[PDB]
Design a protein around this ligand. Structure first.
Ligand SMILES: *[C@@H]1O[C@H](CO)[C@@H](O[C@@H]2O[C@H](CO)[C@@H](O[C@@H]3O[C@H](CO[C@H]4O[C@H](CO[C@H]5O[C@H](CO)[C@@H](O)[C@H](O)[C@@H]5O)[C@@H](O)[C@H](O[C@H]5O[C@H](CO)[C@@H](O)[C@H](O)[C@@H]5O)[C@@H]4O)[C@@H](O)[C@H](O[C@H]4O[C@H](CO)[C@@H](O)[C@H](O)[C@@H]4O)[C@@H]3O)[C@H](O)[C@H]2NC(C)=O)[C@H](O)[C@H]1NC(C)=O
Ligand SMILES: *[C@@H]1O[C@H](CO)[C@@H](O[C@@H]2O[C@H](CO)[C@@H](O[C@@H]3O[C@H](CO[C@H]4O[C@H](CO)[C@@H](O)[C@H](O)[C@@H]4O)[C@@H](O)[C@H](O[C@H]4O[C@H](CO)[C@@H](O)[C@H](O)[C@@H]4O)[C@@H]3O)[C@H](O)[C@H]2NC(C)=O)[C@H](O)[C@H]1NC(C)=O
Ligand code: HEM
Ligand SMILES: O=Cc1ccc(CO)o1
Ligand SMILES: O=Cc1ccc(CO)o1
Ligand SMILES: [Mg+2]
Length: 335
């Protein structure tokens, strides 16, 4: 009949560096039924047992795993996790797939809600990623070697053979241009416009070993290990401080860009959307997502309504801080 979802964990008691690729968290191969998806962070946490190895977890489990494994900052974890859960998880069982659809998330919600997992395109997952291809080309979740070869190429061209903040700026822009030129359904607005800049610095802030204090840069070997194999580098130590999207601003500044998309199902036809969230209008992302949730859940009652109310509030607790203050919305009233 369902679960009563607890509030998110706070930051970890210990926030320093530590060995996370340790004897208790060994890499293991996929078994039948195990789910993996478009996020190399969650994928690696699952394949080392920081998350359930089957790739289905509670919000609380995801938050604690991102903190334990990578020192992902608490509010960034809350913002990402409840966004993913509201849109793509099962609110009644309190379970989210980190990939595609699975019976492991329990009885399906009422359509148009789906609990289809992080693989679901168009409100969270989106276009112009680093190692995943746009959904238009048929697969938005698998590692793509051609794209990784570009990652390596740009690292050679701008980062001395390593991925650093200069590389991030160049790659992000070039990937947007690729999608403009080749994907007639290319969208780069609302959630995706914001998350895409954060994700380009996570490799620097979170995939670089925490004992590297200066000149933080990621080797192609370490990049392949995480992005392709879902495996921590040998002896991997997490960031020495909670971290998330530091430097994303510089990535945008290197190639200023405006949210929008290819209009009218044509390539090379990018039109700005002035209503979209952007980095000086972050609260629009909050409002947009709450609207999306209402479309998924037009008239909930009982446990589903209760858990929607709680999850919306949990998400707001992170958004309020991360976005610098947003008025909470109550589309379903209060408990
Ligand atoms: C990501 O990774 C990449 C790759 O590792 C990394 O890139 C490095 O980035 C730093 C800067 O962020 C680079 O260092 C800087 O280079 C600047 C450009 O240098 C060129 O021009 C210099 C200026 O020449 C003057 O004099 C000549 C007369 O000789 C004149 O004609 C010119 O017009 C001009 O007025 C020149 O000195 C320099 O050449 C020297 O060094 C090279 C070796 O690479 C050597 O071949 C030359 O013979 C010569 O000795 C070069 O051609 C430069 O302006 C800048 O200088 C500032 O700092 C230094 C020291 O701190 C001061 O002394 C100076 O006054 C300046 O204020 C600095 O050196 C570095 O070269 C990049 N490395 C590579 C491999 O690309 C990114 O930083 C990474 N990103 C992140 C975020 O980490
Ligand atoms: C891994 O991910 C990569 C990258 O996303 C996938 O490769 C892309 O595949 C798409 C689909 O085939 C390619 O898109 C097509 O591009 C053509 C033009 O490309 C040329 O120019 C680029 C540079 O701009 C060169 O790099 C490239 O080599 C080409 O020379 C267009 O002609 C195509 O458009 C036609 O169909 C669409 C859809 O209906 C219409 O909108 C168009 O008007 C037109 O009629 C198309 O857009 C894309 O070029 C590929 N990129 C690269 C780098 O290869 C891989 O498929 C994927 N790997 C696997 C195996 O999954
Ligand atoms: C906290 C919960 C998390 C959720 C719900 C989440 C969700 C997602 C989703 C849906 C994507 C796909 C977006 C796309 O490229 O289309 C993604 C991409 C990504 N995530 Fe996460 N993520 C989380 C945590 C993390 C952490 C902790 C890290 C790093 C340690 C991380 C690093 C990345 C990177 C680098 C990508 C981009 C991959 C690429 O473009 O090739 N994420 N994540
Ligand atoms: O992949 C994770 C992600 C994207 C954007 C944010 C903000 O916490 O986290
Ligand atoms: O600046 C944008 C943004 C989105 C999510 C977060 C917090 O990590 O910051
Ligand atoms: Mg994507």
């Amino acid at each position: 009949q369902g679960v009563d979802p607890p509030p998110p964990p706070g930051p970890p008691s210990f926030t320093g560096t530590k060995l996370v690729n340790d004897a208790d968290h060994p890499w293991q191969p996929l078994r039948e039924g195990d789910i993996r998806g478009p996020c190399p962070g969650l994928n690696t946490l699952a394949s080392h047992g920081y998350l359930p190895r089957d790739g289905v977890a509670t919000p609380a489990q995801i938050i604690t795993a991102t903190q334990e494994g990578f020192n992902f900052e608490n509010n960034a974890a809350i913002v990402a996790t409840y966004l993913g859960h509201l849109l793509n998880g099962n609110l009644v069982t309190d379970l989210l797939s980190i990939g595609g659809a699975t019976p492991k998330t329990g009885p399906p919600p009422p359509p148009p809600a789906h609990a289809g997992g992080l693989n679901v395109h168009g409100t969270f997952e989106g276009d112009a990623g680093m190692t995943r291809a746009d959904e238009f080309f048929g697969d938005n979740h698998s590692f793509n070697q051609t794209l990784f070869d570009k990652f390596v190429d740009f690292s050679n061209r701008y980062g001395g053979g390593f991925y650093n903040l200069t590389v991030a700026g160049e790659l992000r822009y070039s990937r947007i241009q690729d999608s403009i030129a080749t994907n007639p359904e290319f969208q780069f607005k609302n959630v995706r416009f914001i998350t895409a800049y954060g994700e380009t610095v996570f490799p620097i802030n979170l995939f670089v070993d925490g004992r590297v204090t200066t000149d933080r840069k990621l080797s192609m070997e370490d990049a392949a290990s995480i992005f392709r194999d879902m495996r921590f580098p040998d002896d991997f130590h997490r960031s020495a401080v909670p971290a998330s999207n530091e430097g994303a601003d510089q990535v945008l500044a290197a190639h200023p860009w405006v949210p929008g998309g290819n209009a009218d199902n044509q390539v090379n036809n990018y039109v700005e959307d002035p209503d979209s969230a952007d980095f000086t209008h972050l609260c629009r992302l909050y409002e947009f997502v709450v609207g999306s949730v209402q479309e998924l859940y037009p008239n909930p009652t009982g446990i589903l309504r209760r858990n929607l109310i709680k999850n919306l509030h949990y998400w707001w607790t992170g958004v309020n801080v991360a976005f610098g203050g947003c008025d909470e919305l109550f589309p379903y009233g209060q408990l």
